[PDB]
């Protein structure tokens with residue numbers, strides 16, 4: 380009960396900042412996550428024996444893909460940690476517990492292919508889950524791991540508290556389906572602007588947690604430019620593999636997934652920042668003012684991509 384995780388001084392300080400990068404030492408990432416749970420939630424939130432066994436089974440069920448890997452899991456959980464730490468009093472005990480776990484689990488057993496590619500391939504998961512295919516799978520893998528012997532990190536919750544947290548995790552993980560983000564943010568925009576947004580309305584909280592999940596999932600675009608630029612390589616490595624697999628099914632992929640159209644990446648990033656990222660962190664900053672550093676970092680990166688296009692890099 381008296382066993383705190385501590386970090387070296389540089390990490391202890393920078394882990395509190397939105398733009399923190401967890402580093403290239405995989406063996407420190409479990410301790411980084413436990414450190415964040417303990418400070419976000421408490422040293423009592425979970426039995427350490429069970430949490431450690433949970434973390435290591437989750438790690439094992441992430442695959443060795445360029446981007447949708449164990450590093451992404453921990454990175455997305457860190458962005459959620461920064462949001463929660465900058466909005467201390469807005470979230471319940473159950474929500475702080477649920478959301479760090481949802482983030483760690485949100486891409487379990489990802490193969491590096493989109494929902495689209497699964498549907499065109501006619502993958503069995505596309506027959507089992509007609510929409511949000513991978514996300515329903517990620518939630519399924521999360522429940523599977525929670526049910527392994529010694530892995531039920533929620534055992535100490537009441538029956539109804541257990542149902543509530545599993546329901547937060549399910550909605551949180553389904554919300555990472557970017558196809559759902561557009562309508563979710565549009566509705567949050569209207570509610571915020573007509574003044575009807577009400578954090579005591581469960582349907583509204585659900586929508587705000589949804590947008591936090593998009594914000595954390597896209598957080599590559601809110602890092603310092605060298606981290607953003609090097610992560611873009613990993614992202615495009617999966618996109619180009621998917622485009623290659625489209626060409627194998629005899630389907631010309633969209634240009635974003637065609638490795639013969641790498642020249643178009645900088646302009647593809649502009650569209651993405653303007654159509655997705657900036658609108659996302661803008662609405663997030665309206666609802667949760669202390670998350671403004673994410674919007675500022677995102678605009679800084681938009682400006683860096685504008686500079687790549689102007690051939691200034």
Ligand SMILES: Cc1nc(N2CCCC2)c2ccc(OCC3CC3)cc2n1
Nearest residue numbers: 557597598599600611614635647648651
């Ligand atoms: C061009 C670009 N870049 C992406 N990543 C860069 C950093 C975060 C995600 C994307 C991540 C998901 C994605 O799904 C497709 C969205 C456009 C309708 C598209 C993306 N398109």
Ligand SMILES: [Mg+2]
Nearest residue numbers: 485486513555
């Ligand atoms: Mg995902």
Ligand SMILES: [Zn+2]
Nearest residue numbers: 485486555596
């Ligand atoms: Zn993700």
